[PDB]
Design a protein around this ligand. Structure first.
Ligand code: NA
Ligand code: NA
Lengths: 339, 334
């Protein structure tokens, strides 16, 4: 209704995650957009860059003035790349804003692991200790008290969410897990690279980053929080489609389907974004594209458990989760303005 | 140009996507010459009425299912017929002395028990037509079962490694992905443009018919495997990629040496061990199988890519026919 209105800004607003985030913020009943920052498209209206939003979000894009942003905003979403994200997050944090950082810079509590993976130095160790990993259906208790939240990566969301309760309850082995995952091309971001051009990706399907994708350590670092050390092997693939992630996950269980289903449905019992199937239904990316849902299908044969996990990469894998995090930091329901 | 060793060949069930790709290859083949193209649905239409891309290339008039007429004008026949029909046709042309390649599954598994099958005597005689492995058996046969498309991408890289004992036979996982042409020319809502476009999905979990095919054939290595196979539908027309997870004790150089030695004379097999990752666009519209190899500690990851309608079907079928007819297996392909 506007009674608990808060001003929110987006830094790095013209990438694909910024577009999905603005779409949500525009219709959110308590967040009011204050600034949309992009150094490249400054002095243009957001609807000049994204004409689909003409007459819905016509806010004039401004340049990088962080003092300007802090003085007009209660909260900021950072869609910046690494390193720049650290400086901005640190600035807006001490100014007293609520901060959601899309980047990886504050996700990994282990500083050397970060520097080794991202090949850049981490210069805010105390802030790194304070940041909360933004998986709303798992770490809600901690997010509600946070002022700095590291938004999870898109592939880690699709793999962590179904595995977390089963590891913690001891129903699957922590060793030998294979996640064979596939994403739409929007996962590369708004890029001019030849490798992301239409003619190179259209009709093509490929693995990439074999034994080397920066999300594999994130998955295993977070799942350690279940009390069990994991060695998930993660391999991504590029789908000739704009949006959508599917993860096929292979595990070993001593339990039967009924117990595995009860563990997941009990753990996610109040979480409207989590849709769990145990009846033979197979999630596909079209079931979750343009939604904030995560769909999980369960299949058991003997000791083999296969999990199919689907999300929209830009919404449950990024912007929608970012708004759930912001909702939670602001005292709102996690699904406010979402579903 | 007609060749000095010309032979006549017919195609039964010619108007599906496998028949289309097969006709493309036959029309350019320097020795095979098309005699009949049979399709009860499109009889009395020219092949290029169904596939206008082939206009002025293959304008052969399609005929109905009169198998005596085919046998009288053909030295050999390709059967792209559905289950059961394929059994009677292959029994007929075998009696009449024709070389036969059957695209269906009805003659792939020697063990009748897995099928449950009429013609059990004939089932004994059918040869599994994986040309880069069973060449010996193929040349001496009169009935070949063309292998399935997914088994082709998975058996081919795993066979030598199991035989040489370089990977474990237990615990192998094949996570495989295919273009929609793998469903054949069908009027099903599930295969419509609007249902498949922009969508990606696993299917047939724990239940795809190609998965016992993979394991039955790999038993010929001397190893009892339990390959877990899961297929997925790509929103693209053609192409298979198989990501294969194995356990090895051997190093990259040894695994590579095994594969490149076992396939050293086989021009359709392209093996990479240098970090190059194959993609479906590298093999689409070709008869190549591209294999990438990746080792970390005890983990071997294999990436295997084919055109599902050519190397996984029609181009392989012409390899099998070439071999049965005394030609080099890549004649008219490379
Ligand atoms: Na709003
Ligand atoms: Na020809």
């Amino acid at each position: 209704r506007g009674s608990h209105m808060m001003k929110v800004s987006v830094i790095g607003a013209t990438g694909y995650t910024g577009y999905e985030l603005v779409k949500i913020l525009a219709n959110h009943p308590e967040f009011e957009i204050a600034a949309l920052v992009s150094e490249t498209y400054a002095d243009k209206m957001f609807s000049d860059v994204y004409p689909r939003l003409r007459s819905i979000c016509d806010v004039v894009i401004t340049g990088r003035d962080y003092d300007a942003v802090a003085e007009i905003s209660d909260a900021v979403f950072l869609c910046l790349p690494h390193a720049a994200a650290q400086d901005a997050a640190a600035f807006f944090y001490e100014k007293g804003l609520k901060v959601v950082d899309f980047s990886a810079d504050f996700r990994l509590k282990d500083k050397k692991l970060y520097e080794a993976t991202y090949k850049v130095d981490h210069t805010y160790p105390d802030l790194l200790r304070k940041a909360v990993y933004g998986l709303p259906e798992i770490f809600e208790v901690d997010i509600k008290k946070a002022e700095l939240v590291a938004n999870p990566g898109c592939y880690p969301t699709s793999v962590i969410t179904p595995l977390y309760p089963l590891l913690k309850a001891g129903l699957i082995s922590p060793e030998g897990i294979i996640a064979d995952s596939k994403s739409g091309v929007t996962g590369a971001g708004r890029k001019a690279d030849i490798a992301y051009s239409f003619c190179e990706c259209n009709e093509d399907f490929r693995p990439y980053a074999i034994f080397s994708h920066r999300h594999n350590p994130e998955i295993n670092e977070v799942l350690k929080e279940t009390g069990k050390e994991t060695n998930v092997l993660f391999t991504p693939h590029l789908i000739p489609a704009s949006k959508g992630i599917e993860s096929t996950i292979y595990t070993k269980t001593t339990a039967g389907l009924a117990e595995i289903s009860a563990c997941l449905k009990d753990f996610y019992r109040e979480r409207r974004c989590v849709r769990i199937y145990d009846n033979g239904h197979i999630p596909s990316t079209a079931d979750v594209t343009d939604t904030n849902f995560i769909d999980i299908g369960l299949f058991v044969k003997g000791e083999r458990l296969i999990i199919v996990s689907c999300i929209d990469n830009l919404i449950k894998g990024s912007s929608g989760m970012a708004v759930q995090n912001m909702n939670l930091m602001c005292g709102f329901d996690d699904t406010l303005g979402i579903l």
